[PDB]
Amino acid sequence: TQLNRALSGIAAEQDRNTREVFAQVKQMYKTPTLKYFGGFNFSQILPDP
Amino acid sequence: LKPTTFMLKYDENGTITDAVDCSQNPLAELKCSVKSFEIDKGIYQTSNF
Numbered sequence: 456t457q458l459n460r461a462l463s464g465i466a467a468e469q470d471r472n473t474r475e476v477f478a479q480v481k482q483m484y485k486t487p488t489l490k491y492f493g494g495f496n497f498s499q500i501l502p503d504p
Numbered sequence: 505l506k507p508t509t510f511m512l513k514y515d516e517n518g519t520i521t522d523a524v525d526c527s528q529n530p531l532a533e534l535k536c537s538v539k540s541f542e543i544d545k546g547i548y549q550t551s552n553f
């Protein structure tokens with residue numbers, strides 16, 4: 456019991472760590488079509504649709 | 505009479521007031537595990553299959 460409870464606790468805090476870093480976004484926003492914002496080419500940082 | 509496992513609640517004077525058959529259904533298998541008659545919403549760990 457102690458073992459199972461120990462590993463599940465260690466495992467469950469790995470999902471807490473991932474949401475604490477990434478999930479700071481309240482709304483999903485769309486990818487704009489314009490990526491040369493004043494010449495600033497942003498095609499590499501954005502996802503390729 | 506069968507060799508099963510029960511959990512027994514004792515009052516202030518040692519009267520068995522309530523019992524849970526630990527092999528009845530997966531709900532009652534959980535109450536025997538966590539030592540409670542009332543269990544909060546979520547996922548809890550129980551025995552392996």
Ligand SMILES: *[C@@H]1O[C@H](CO)[C@@H](O[C@@H]2O[C@H](CO)[C@@H](O)[C@H](O)[C@H]2NC(C)=O)[C@H](O)[C@H]1NC(C)=O
Nearest residue numbers: 490491492493494495496497498499500501503
């Ligand atoms: C911004 O950078 C992208 C690369 O991320 C450039 O896109 C490439 O353009 C060349 C020229 O036709 C193509 O052969 C490549 O296939 C393109 N890359 C991709 C991933 O499609 C883009 O040209 C740059 N912007 C400007 C204004 O030069």
Ligand SMILES: *[C@@H]1O[C@H](CO)[C@@H](O[C@@H]2O[C@H](CO)[C@@H](O)[C@H](O)[C@H]2NC(C)=O)[C@H](O)[C@H]1NC(C)=O
Nearest residue numbers: 512513514515516517518519520521522523541
């Ligand atoms: C355990 O037994 C005692 C008796 O010694 C109970 O105390 C009595 O309880 C009744 C009603 O519950 C009261 O009317 C009496 O006045 C109590 N007597 C004394 C001396 O306090 C006690 O209630 C029992 N415990 C439980 C949980 O029922």
